[PDB]
Symmetry: D2
């Protein structure tokens, strides 16, 4: 019952925290700093947002690796924002 489900949830939570720790980048989205991971490591730059303190939007300017981008579209990747970014 819950046991199995509660276990699975914790494993998923720890699994994502590890991916973010290993490949995450520090990035600024609409004024808020957060961690993102390039889609290269998981699969017009593409990245999925791991921090839970931001809600990215189409329009938002994203500073990544010193360059400015614009979130042109937003998909889902296991419930996480997958952003399509375009140079400015």
């Amino acid at each position: 019952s819950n046991a199995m489900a509660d276990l699975f949830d914790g494993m998923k939570r720890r699994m994502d925290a590890l991916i973010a720790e290993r490949f995450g980048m520090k990035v600024n989205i609409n004024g808020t700093d957060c961690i993102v991971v390039e889609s290269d490591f998981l699969a017009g730059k593409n990245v999925v947002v791991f921090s839970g303190n931001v809600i990215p939007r189409r329009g938002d300017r994203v500073v990544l690796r010193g360059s400015e981008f614009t979130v042109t579209r937003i998909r889902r990747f296991n419930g996480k924002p997958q952003l399509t970014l375009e140079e400015n």
Copy 2:
């Protein structure tokens, strides 16, 4: 790199398929049959949708266990539709 990430993805995919197999219910949402799991097993009926062949919406009538419901709101649960259903 990808190895770890590709592994994690497969584990997540298999983990959800098992939860659906063990606790999933067969239910009809807006004319389409699909599998859903009561939130009781994972945490005004509440359920998360596991089948990938439906896109639930506020308004949709849901036949569950012989009764009709209406999806009043839709949240996310690890990227899956979590529906709040009300009796008719």
Copy 3:
């Protein structure tokens, strides 16, 4: 590094505790009570020992489900004692 390895270890530890919780049986081996799981659920009765407080041996009498057995041979199953038991 350790992170990934430490994570994997904990998942394995929790994974086994769940299997034991769901299918484990209470059994007496050479005077000590412990949990065992029938090989039917994992693959001349055959079982693997989950409790860490016993060290089974060829010769040992095992009371299981009301009947007495003798451990005729001992293999390994992911590092756990897999006992071959014969009726008395």
Copy 4:
């Protein structure tokens, strides 16, 4: 039933193969080449043997990183040989 158990087994199998891939070393034990991982990454050199084609023994000479060692003792680490090696 088996489903959960069969899933857990596969995850464990894939989990170990990944650790070996990331930290494994190529080493010769009693004439046979195999993969080993330093205990530093998992916890008088100490290592656990991942390859399934060897059966290490006390006495065996082990060539590791260009140096010769002797397996002085053998423990278990989740069912895998954990060897204690001494310089020659």
